[PDB]
Amino acid sequence: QLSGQQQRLLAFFKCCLLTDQLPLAHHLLVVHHGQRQKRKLLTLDMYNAVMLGWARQGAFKELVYVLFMVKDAGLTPDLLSYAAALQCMGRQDQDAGTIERCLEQMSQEGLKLQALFTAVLLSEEDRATVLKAVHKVKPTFSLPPQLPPPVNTSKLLRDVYAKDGRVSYPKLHLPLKTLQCLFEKQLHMELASRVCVVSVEKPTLPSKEVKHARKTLKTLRDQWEKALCRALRETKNRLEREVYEGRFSLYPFLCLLDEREVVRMLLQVLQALPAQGESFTTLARELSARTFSRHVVQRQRVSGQVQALQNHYRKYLCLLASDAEVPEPCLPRQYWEELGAPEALREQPWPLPVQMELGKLLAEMLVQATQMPCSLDRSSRLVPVLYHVYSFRNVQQIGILKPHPAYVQLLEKAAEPTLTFEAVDVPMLCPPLPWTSPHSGAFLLSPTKLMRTVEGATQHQELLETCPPTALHGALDALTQLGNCAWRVNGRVLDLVLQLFQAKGCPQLGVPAPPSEAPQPPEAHLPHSAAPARKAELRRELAHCQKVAREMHSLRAEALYRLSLAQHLRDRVFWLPHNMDFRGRTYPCPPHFNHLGSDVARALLEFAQGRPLGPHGLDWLKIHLVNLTGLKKREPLRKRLAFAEEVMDDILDSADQPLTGRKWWMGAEEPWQTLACCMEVANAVRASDPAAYVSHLPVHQDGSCNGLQHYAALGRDSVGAASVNLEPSDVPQDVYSGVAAQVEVFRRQDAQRGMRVAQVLEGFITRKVVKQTVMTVVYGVTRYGGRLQIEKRLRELSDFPQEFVWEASHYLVRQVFKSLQEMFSGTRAIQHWLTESARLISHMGSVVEWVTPLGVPVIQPYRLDSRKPNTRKQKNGFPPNFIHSLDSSHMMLTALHCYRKGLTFVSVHDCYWTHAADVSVMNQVCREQFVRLHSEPILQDLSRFLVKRFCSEPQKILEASQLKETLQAVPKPGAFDLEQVKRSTYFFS
Amino acid sequence: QLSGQQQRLLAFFKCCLLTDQLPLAHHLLVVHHGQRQKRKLLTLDMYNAVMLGWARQGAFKELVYVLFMVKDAGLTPDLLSYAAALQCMGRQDQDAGTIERCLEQMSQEGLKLQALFTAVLLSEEDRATVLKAVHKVKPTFSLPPQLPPPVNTSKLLRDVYAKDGRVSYPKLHLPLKTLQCLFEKQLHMELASRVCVVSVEKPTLPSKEVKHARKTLKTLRDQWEKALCRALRETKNRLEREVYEGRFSLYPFLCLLDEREVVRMLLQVLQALPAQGESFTTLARELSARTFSRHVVQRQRVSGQVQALQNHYRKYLCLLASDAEVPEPCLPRQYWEELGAPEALREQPWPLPVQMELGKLLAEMLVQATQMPCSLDRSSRLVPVLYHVYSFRNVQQIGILKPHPAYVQLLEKAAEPTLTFEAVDVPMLCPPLPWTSPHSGAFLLSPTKLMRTVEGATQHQELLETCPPTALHGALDALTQLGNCAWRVNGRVLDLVLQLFQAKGCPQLGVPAPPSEAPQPPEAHLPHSAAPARKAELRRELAHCQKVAREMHSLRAEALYRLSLAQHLRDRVFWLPHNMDFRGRTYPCPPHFNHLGSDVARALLEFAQGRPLGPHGLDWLKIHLVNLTGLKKREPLRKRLAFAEEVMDDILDSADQPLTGRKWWMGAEEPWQTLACCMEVANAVRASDPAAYVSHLPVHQDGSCNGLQHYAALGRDSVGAASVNLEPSDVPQDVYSGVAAQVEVFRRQDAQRGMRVAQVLEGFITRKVVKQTVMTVVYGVTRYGGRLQIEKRLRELSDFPQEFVWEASHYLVRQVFKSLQEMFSGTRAIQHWLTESARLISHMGSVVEWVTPLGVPVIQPYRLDSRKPNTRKQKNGFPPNFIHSLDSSHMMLTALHCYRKGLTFVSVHDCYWTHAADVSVMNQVCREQFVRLHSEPILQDLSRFLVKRFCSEPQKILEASQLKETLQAVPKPGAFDLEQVKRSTYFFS
DNA sequence: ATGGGGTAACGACGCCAGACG
RNA sequence: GCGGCGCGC
DNA sequence: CGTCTGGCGTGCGCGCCGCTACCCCAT
C-alpha cells in the first residue's frame, strides 16, 4: 500500500544517498520511528535506504542501529538489508566470524546468497565491496557465467541480425578526428544545458533608447542574481530546519545541484518567460525537469562518467567515420554495446508530488526574490517582476504567472540580439548515442524517454523493461538509424526566406508578416453624440483586428525560433535523435527545426552527405520536382518526367532569379520545396557530368491513404487494394478525387430532391475540400471533427456564400462518410470487429494491450479518474492505434533493410525519403517489407493474443464467453493477391 | 442540501444588499444561470436576495428578469419572491391590476397573504412598501392585533414578575444628566472601536535612544498606512474583476467598511501583534470579527440607529438615575421594551468559510504591504515586517505569523507609552444595554453573544430563539442585573500594587517581577578543553532559566494590561456586562480587569455606590476580614468577630502603614483583599458614627463544596447534607479537612502494610494538598487530572522528598477518590444514574439535552468529526454540567429576589457578594431560593423529560426500552429535611 | 559587536473500535 | 493549534 | 457472536507568552 506522504519520505531517504547527507536522513528516520503515529508511515525500503547510505560510509554502528529499528518496527530484513550489511563488512574489512553469522542469519530467513546479486540494484562499487566480504567466508563463490549477447530471432527481424548475408552499412563523409571535435562541441553544449542563438529579427530601433534599456536591464539582472543566491540559501536553511524537527522537506533535493546552476537556470526561465504569462503548473513541471536534467549532468561530470563517455564514443566513431574501419561489420547499437558496456547506472525519476512541490518552490522563490522599480526611467518603489493572475474562462480557475508590463517593455526596448534554448531542444552537433534500452540513447548526458506518451507513462515505461531485452531491438535500431542521418541547411533557401522575413514577410509563401503589417481599424472611435449601434460596430471590428494581430504574432514568434536555429546551424552538420509514441510511431526529439514540418521547414534542410545521381538520379529529381508542384498528380511517372522537360526553362529561371524572375515556383503546391528542387536540377544539369553530380536533396515516395492501404492488405480486399494503389496500374488511383466525384453525384441527387444546401454547393465539391477528411477518417476522425476540417476549406473559397458554411460542412461530412462506407465495405467490417472487441475488453475494466509483429508491446493509456478504463477512448482509439502500429512496423522494416543496402533513410510516417540515386532500391524494399509484414496472419495472431490475454479470468466466465465469441469472429479475407504490391508503381509514389 | 460554495454564493448576494451593488450581484447570478453546470449551484434564496435588492431600488424590469430565471431554473416562487414583487409595486406606485394579478398568482401557488408578514424577515421600510401595494387592491386588510407583552409564569419565576408584592428596586447614586454624559463617552469609545490606555510600565530608558526609535517608527507607520490604502484598493480591483468573470470573490465584503477604518484596524493589529507570533488561523478569525463588528457600527452610524439609541437610552436612564422617577415600578429590561421597542433589525453572521477567507485575505494583505529596512540605523534593502513560521511540535504543522526581530527591537527602543484595546474588551463607562433577546444586550453598538460557547454554537444559538420568548426572561434579567452593578477602583490598593510593580515586583504578594529579576545562569559557558558532561550540565541549567524567564514574562504582561486598565478607570465608575456559557453559568464580558480574578484583582475593585453599615455592617466587615485571613476557618461567626477585636491594632497598623508597619495583612490567605478590608474597617471605626459610615466594600458568603451541596439536596442525603453544611450546626463542617484526616488514616494503614509511598508521606497529608481535588471531582476531575493538582501542592513543600512526587500524587489521588466515595455514597448513586443515562442517550447517536427549572434549554456540544456525538465527553460531562445548571439557577433566583429587596448583588458562581449592610437579607434569600429550587422533584422532572425527548423513536424500540429502564431508575431520596437549610448558618459563609 | 547565517541530530487506566477467534 | 505557566470555582 | 489489544484523552472558565538551540562567522 503506497501513499502520497510515503512516496515523499522514500524519495527523501534515496535523495540523501545522492547528497551523502546520512546524519540528516538518519535523524528524520529516528524521529519518525520514535513517534507512535509516524512509525507506521515508515517502510522496509526507507530503513534500507539509510542502511545502504551508512554501509557506503563504512558506518557499521549506524547500520546496526537501523537494523534494530527494522526488527523493532517490527519488520523483517530482506536481500537489500543483507547486501547493505555485507558492503559495510567488506569496506571496513570485518572478521570472517561476523560475515559467516550474517550469511547464516540470511539462510534462516530463507534468503539465498545468489538471489542477492540478481534482485538487488547495486553500483560496480556496491557489487565489489559485497563480494570482498563473501570471498572471506566462501572463497569459492562464483557469479553466473556471462556475458554472451542474444540476437533477435523474430520472423521479420531474423535477416536484419543474421550474420548470413552481404552487408554494405553506410559510413559518414566526415573523418574520425572531425567527428571527435563535433562530439566535444556537443558535450560542451550539454554541460552548459543552454544554447545561445542570434535572433534573425530586426535591427530597426534607435541606439539611445536601446543603450539605456540595456544598461537598466544589466543592473536589474545583477540585482536578481544576488537576490536569488540569497533566497536559495535562506530556503535551504528553512527546509533544513524542518528536517531538524521530525518533518519531511525538499532540503536534500535542493542539495542535488550547484547553487550557481540553480540561479543560472531561474535567470534563464525569467528572461524567456512569455509576456502573456505561463500556467504556474506548466512552469512548475519545467522547473523540476530542468533541475533533474542538470543534476544528472552534474553527477556524471563529478563521477568520471563524462571521461568514460569520451573514451567510449571516440572508439564508437570508427564504425561511422570515413577514414576508419571496424573488426567485423555490425549496427551502431551492436558496436556501442561491444566496446563497453557496464551500461553505467540508472536513476529512477521523482514521485509526481515531489516534482510539483520542487517546481512550485523554485517558481515562488523566483517570484519572491525578483524586484524592480515600477517608476521605470529617483526610481523609488520596488514591485515584483512576476505576478499571479487567474484565467476564469475554464470554469475551473487556472493560475498563470505573468511578468510585469514595465519589465516586458524594458526587454522590448533592450532589443536583446540572442535567444536561448535548452540543449535537448536543439539538434545534436554530433551523431546521437545509440538506443541501447528505454533509458539509454539520443542525447549524450541529458536523459531521454524512449516513449513520449506522458499519459499512462508508468504502465508503458515498465512494460518496455518487462519484455525480453531482444524484443525491442528492431525499434531501437530503427530509431538509432533515423537519428544517424546527417543533415545540413540549404543556405540559398535560408537567405531568401530571411530576405522576406526581415522585411514585410510573405504570407502567400508561408512566411509570417511583422506586427507592422497587422490590420488597423479604419478609423479609431469618433464618439460620443452618435451612435449606440455604430459604437458596438467598431467594437466588433476592433475585436477581429486584435484576433488577427494575435494570430499573426503567434506565427511570427514560431518562425523566429525555427529560422534563428537554421541561421545558427547554417555552416554546420547536425543530427536529429528520434523517439516513439505509445503506438510505435517515430518523431524527432528537437521540436523547433526539423523535416516533419511545413514547406519552408522542409526546404531549408537537405542531407549533409550527397550521393552521385547515377543513371536515373536526374529523372528522379525531375519526377520529385513535378510531384512537389502538384500539377501532374493524376499522370504516370513518364508524363511527370516529360512535363519537367517542357517547363525546364521555368525550373532554371526559378532557380536563378527566385524573387526577380518569372517566379514559376511560387505557383507550386509546395513552393519552397519546388524551388529547392529547381536549384538541385539546375546544379545537376550544369555539372560537367550530371550522372556524377553529388546530390544532397532527399526524394520522397509516399503511400496514398496509408491507413486504408493497411486495411486493404489485412482484409485482402480487391476493391480497396485497387483504390489505394496496392493493385498495379499504369496510372495512380486517387481516392480523394474518387470521394469528391461521388459526393457531387449525391449533391446532384439532393439538389433535385429540393435540398437547399445541395443547390448552393453546385461547383464547390473539389478534391481539396474533402482530402483531409478522406485521409484522417481511418485515423479516427468523426463527423464532428470532419465538419470542422471541411469548414476551413469552405471559408477560404470567397465565391462560396459564407452564410451556408455550417449547413454545407454538416452536409459534406455525412456525404464524405457515406462515400467511404460504400467504397471501403471490406475495411468497414475490420473497423467494426476491432471497435467491438475493444468495447468489450474495456467494459470488463481492462485497457486494450497488444504486441506489434516486430515485438513492441502497445498499451492504450485511456483511463478515467485504481483509474477505470475510458471505454469510449479505448473503443474509438483501438482501430487507428492498431493501424498506426502496423504502418510503424512497415516503416521500421523498410529503414532496417535499406540500411543493409547502404541507403540513407528518413521518413514522415508514410512518406519515405532517400537520395535520388537510390529511389528504386527504397521502393523495392518498401514493397517487399509491406508484403512480408502483411503475409503473416496479423488479424489471426491478434485474435489468438486477445483470447489468451483477456479470456483467462476464472470468474466471471459469462463476460469472457461473449468476448471469445467476438474475438474469434475474425472477418474473412478477400481475393487480392498481396504479392502484386511488389509490381505496383503508385503504391508509394 | 447546503454546500461550501453555495454558502459563499448566498452570502455574496446578501452582502450586495448591504452594499447596494445590485448590478454586480445580478451579473454573477446571470453568469451562473447561463452556464449548465453552474445553474444547479443556484438556489431560490439566492435569486430572491437579488430580487429583494432590485425591489428596494424600484427596479421592476430587473425584478421581473430574476422571476424569469427562477421559473427557468425551474424553481417555484415562495413568500419572499411575492413580498419582493409587492415592495417594488408599492415603491413604484404600480396599478391595482398588476397587484391583484400578483395576489391571485400567490393564491394559485397555495400561498397565503397573512403568512407573508409572519414568515418573511423584513425591515420597517420593507414592511411599509408591501402594505401600500396591498391597501390598493385589499384596502380592508388588517395585520393581527398587537402588542400585549407576556410575563413569565414559571413556578419559581412567578413572584419575580407578578405585580402583586412590594418592590424596592435599587437606583444609582448618579443623577440623570451625569449618566447621559457617561452614555455619550461610551458611545464615542464604541464608534472608534479602540481604547487607548497609558502603560503602567517604566520609564527607565535614555531619551537619545527613544527619540530616534520613535522618529523611525512614525516614518515607517506613515509608509505602512499609504501602502495598506494602496493594497486595499488593488485587492478590491482584483476581486471586482473576478465577479466580472463568472466567479465569486470577497469583493462586496471589503465594501462593507470604510477603507480608512480597514487600514486603521490592520495598523492596530500590527502594533499589538505579539513578538513570539500568532497562529495565522487565530489572526484570521480576529481580523474577520473586527471587520464585522466595525461594519455593524458603521451601518448604525449611517442609518440613524445611533440617534435612535441615544433617544431610547436617555429615556431609559430615568429608571436608574437618583434624581428621576418612572410611571410604574419595573425591571430594566421591562422599561427598555416599554419605551421603544421596534427591536431594530438583526444581521445573521457570515458562513465560517467566508469568515476564514476574509481574515486570511486581510492578514496576507498586511504581510504583503508592510515593508521595512533590515539595515536598522543608507537603510537600503526592504524586508517584510511579518513572516510565516511553522510549529512542528503539534505533529500537525500549524502556521504562525511572527514579526521581524528588528521590528520588535524598534518598538522596544521606542518605549511607546500607550496600550490599545478593542472597545468590547474593556468595562463600559455607562450602565450596559439590558438583555432583551439572545442577540440584543450588553454593549451599545457592537454585537454580543448571549452564550459564549463557540463549539456547537449553531445548535445552542438556534434553541435560544426556538424556545418561548418568556422562557429566557429569568436568565436575561439576572444577566442585566449583574451587568448593572456599578464598580470603582480602590485607589489606595492600586498605588501600593503599582509601587511594587514599577520597582522589582513582589511575587510573594502575587505581583510579577520585571525581567531584571529573572534568574541568571552562574556562570555563562567557560569551554572547550573540559568537559562533555559539564557542557550538557550548563545546557540543562540554561534551559530552566529560559523556562522561568518565559513564565515570569507571561505573568508580567498579563498584570501590565490589568493594571493599566485599573489606572485608566481610577477616577471613573464602570460596569461589567455579563454573558452565559452553555450550562447557564455567568461570566463578565470584559476579560482583563474584573472580580472573577485573583486576590490583587479582587482587591482593586469595590462597589461605586456605598451603603451605610447600619447596626450589623461593621461586624460583617470584621467577619469578612477574618474570613479573608483564612485563620479562623473552623471557628463560628462569633469567634471570628472576637478574633477581629483582638487583632484590631494589627488591622489598623496594616491599613495605615501597609509596606512600612508590622505588615500583618501580608500573612493572610488573601492578603490584598485583607488589606482592602483593613482600610474599610479603619475608615468605619474612625468615622463620627460607624453605623452611618457609607461602605463600598463587597462582603462574600460562599457555599462550601457547592457541587456536593446540590447532590446532598437532590438525594436528600442526611450524611452528605451534614458534611457540606445543609444541616444546621453551630460550627462549620469542612469536607476538605474531613478528606485529609481520612487519607492520613489510610496512609497510616498502608505504611504499616509495608508501602514505601505511605511511609514517605508521614506528616504531609494536609487540607491544602487535597482541597482542589475534593472541590473539583464533583465537576468532573478524574484520577489523571487529580494527580496533577496534587503534584503542584507536593512540589511547593521543600521538606517533601521530590524524588517521590509522582508515586505520592498517584497514591494520594486514589486515596482522595476512595474517601469521597465512602463519605458521599448517596451522591455516588445519582452520579452513576446521570452518567449511565447519558452513555445510553449518546450511544443512540443523540446529544444530551435538558431544560433548567428556570426554563433555559441546555445542549451538550460534544460531537466528533453529520458529526456523531462524542459518547465519552457526553457521559462524563453530563453530571457536572447538570449540577452547574442547578447552581446557575440558584444564583439567578438569589439575584432576582435580592433585587426586589433593593440589594446590590454580584457572584463568582457559588460565592455571593453584597454590601456589609445587607449580608443577612442576602443569606435569607440565598437559603429560601435553594430550598424553593430543590423542593421541586428535579430528578423526577428530568427523568420524565428524557423519557419524552429520547424514548419517542418508532424504530428501534429495543434501545429505547433499555433507556426507559435506566431513566425511570431514579435513585430514592434520603431522610434529610430540606427546610433545615433556612436555619443553617454555614451553608453559605 | 552583534544580528542572523548555518547546522546540529520512567511511571495510569477506562473507553470503545477494529481485529481477531 | 499545541505547549508552558498563572488565576478562579 | 465473545474475547484480545492498542491508541486516545483525561475539568473547564479566563489570562499571558512561546512556537528549537546557539556557536561564531560575517558585516
Next chain:
RNA sequence: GCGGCGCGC
C-alpha cells in the same frame, strides 16, 4: 489547463 491559430499525416 482551456482557448485562438498554424503545420504535419
